[PDB]
Amino acid sequence: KKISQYACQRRTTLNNYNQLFTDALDILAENDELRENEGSCLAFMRASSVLKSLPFPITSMKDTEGIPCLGDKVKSIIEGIIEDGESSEAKAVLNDERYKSFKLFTSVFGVGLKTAEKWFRMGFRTLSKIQSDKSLRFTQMQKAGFLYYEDLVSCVNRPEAEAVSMLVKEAVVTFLPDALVTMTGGFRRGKMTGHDVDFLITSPEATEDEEQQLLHKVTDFWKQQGLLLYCDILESTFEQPSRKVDALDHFQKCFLILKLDHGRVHSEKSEGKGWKAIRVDLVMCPYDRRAFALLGWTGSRQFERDLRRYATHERKMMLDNHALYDRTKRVFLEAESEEEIFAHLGLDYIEPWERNA
Numbered sequence: 513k514k515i516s517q518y519a520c521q522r523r524t525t526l527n528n529y530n531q532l533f534t535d536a537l538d539i540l541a542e543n544d545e546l547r548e549n550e551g552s553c554l555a556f557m558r559a560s561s562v563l564k565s566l567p568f569p570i571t572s573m574k575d576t577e578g579i580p581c582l583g584d585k586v587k588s589i590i591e592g593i594i595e596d597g598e599s600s601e602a603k604a605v606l607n608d609e610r611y612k613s614f615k616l617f618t619s620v621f622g623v624g625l626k627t628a629e630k631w632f633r634m635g636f637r638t639l640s641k642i643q644s645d646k647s648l649r650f651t652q653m654q655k656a657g658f659l660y661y662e663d664l665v666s667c668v669n670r671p672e673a674e675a676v677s678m679l680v681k682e683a684v685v686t687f688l689p690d691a692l693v694t695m696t697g698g699f700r701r702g703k704m705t706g707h708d709v710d711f712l713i714t715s716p717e718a719t720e721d722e723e724q725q726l727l728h729k730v731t732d733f734w735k736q737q738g739l740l741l742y743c744d745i746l747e748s749t750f751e752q753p754s755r756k757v758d759a760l761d762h763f764q765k766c767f768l769i770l771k772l773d774h775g776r777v778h779s780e781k782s783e784g785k786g787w788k789a790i791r792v793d794l795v796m797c798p799y800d801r802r803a804f805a806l807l808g809w810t811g812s813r814q815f816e817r818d819l820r821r822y823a824t825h826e827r828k829m830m831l832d833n834h835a836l837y838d839r840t841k842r843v844f845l846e847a848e849s850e851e852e853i854f855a856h857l858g859l860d861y862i863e864p865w866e867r868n869a
């Protein structure tokens with residue numbers, strides 16, 4: 513069949529048949545992303561993404577006939593796989609000192625690219641010789657991502673995620689039995705493990721007052737017990753759906769790190785530190801906007817991008833993290849479910865576990 517160039521019309525399941533290429537592409541892509549080069553990183557992700565779609569491994573350079581997002585540059589990258597087994601380019605970058613370190617520092621919760629670059633140039637090459645250095649002071653968000661570096665870098669599975677879900681509920685519920693918490697992000701896509709536990713919190717009966725207070729009280733609540741390890745409650749700023757470099761307007765969200773006493777987890781498995789620091793996101797959205805919060809905060813990163821990218825370029829509409837807009841009939845189209853939204857963008861629904869680009 514003749515597929516599409518818009519991930520929004522792609523069925524990207526976690527069942528990948530080209531992990532080989534895809535991986536090697538993700539390296540070069542993560543490369544261009546760090547070597548401050550916002551360009552090629554686009555033809556990489558977009559290519560590596562398409563492949564994740566195919567229902568069969570690519571064998572001969574013959575199969576790549578038809579498939580889009582595949583320019584003469586990337587093929588020579590697949591080339592080095594078919595007739596070799598690994599990508600000389602990729603295989604190269606992994607041992608490239610700029611990369612290694614960068615992906616080594618940013619790996620810290622709190623370490624950005626601007627911060628991970630001033631260090632590289634200072635000469636540091638390991639984070640063992642950084643925290644130690646008695647000179648440069650660390651932002652709280654960094655001291656944090658540092659103090660718990662271990663458990664954090666250790667990823668999380670479902671059983672862990674779930675321990676957090678109740679955790680959140682038994683809490684948020686104590687401030688709104690009306691509350692509706694949906695486990696969102698990667699985990700809701702079907703990843704059996706992710707970096708963090710993304711959540712979306714909402715409720716029908718709730719004033720525009722009770723909203724801007726819950727993300728704090730709940731925070732304070734765990735704080736009251738010890739479970740809170742770090743917090744950064746960004747006040748809801750967002751409310752014309754943006755389309756360029758805007759993370760400037762968002763729902764009320766918060767980045768955290770909880771203390772998940774292992775006793776409170778349900779895994780078929782039998783260590784010091786009965787608990788584990790775990791990264792969690794939290795978002796609140798007035799009930800009349802759950803429909804987009806979910807879609808927006810559900811990913812995939814690349815999926816979202818291509819979604820609204822389609823929205824604009826193909827339907828003359830604007831898809832916000834909050835609300836869509838029809839530039840032709842100049843009206844705010846809305847919906848009570850993701851399902852409806854696609855129907856609006858004129859798209860055959862893509863189940864959440866199908867948005868794994």
Ligand SMILES: Nc1ncnc2c1ncn2[C@H]1CC[C@@H](COP(=O)(O)OP(=O)(O)OP(=O)(O)O)O1
Nearest residue numbers: 697698699705706707708759808809811813833
């Ligand atoms: N500034 C932003 N503006 C809009 N959406 C954002 C912004 N930051 C994050 N998001 C949304 C889009 C993707 C979703 C992403 O998160 P994350 O990167 O935590 O998801 P993941 O779930 O894919 O990775 P992991 O398994 O590590 O959580 O949250």
Ligand SMILES: [Co+2]
Nearest residue numbers: 697708709710
């Ligand atoms: Co996440």
Ligand SMILES: [Co+2]
Nearest residue numbers: 697708710793
């Ligand atoms: Co997140």
Ligand code: NA
Nearest residue numbers: 618620622623
């Ligand atoms: Na980071």
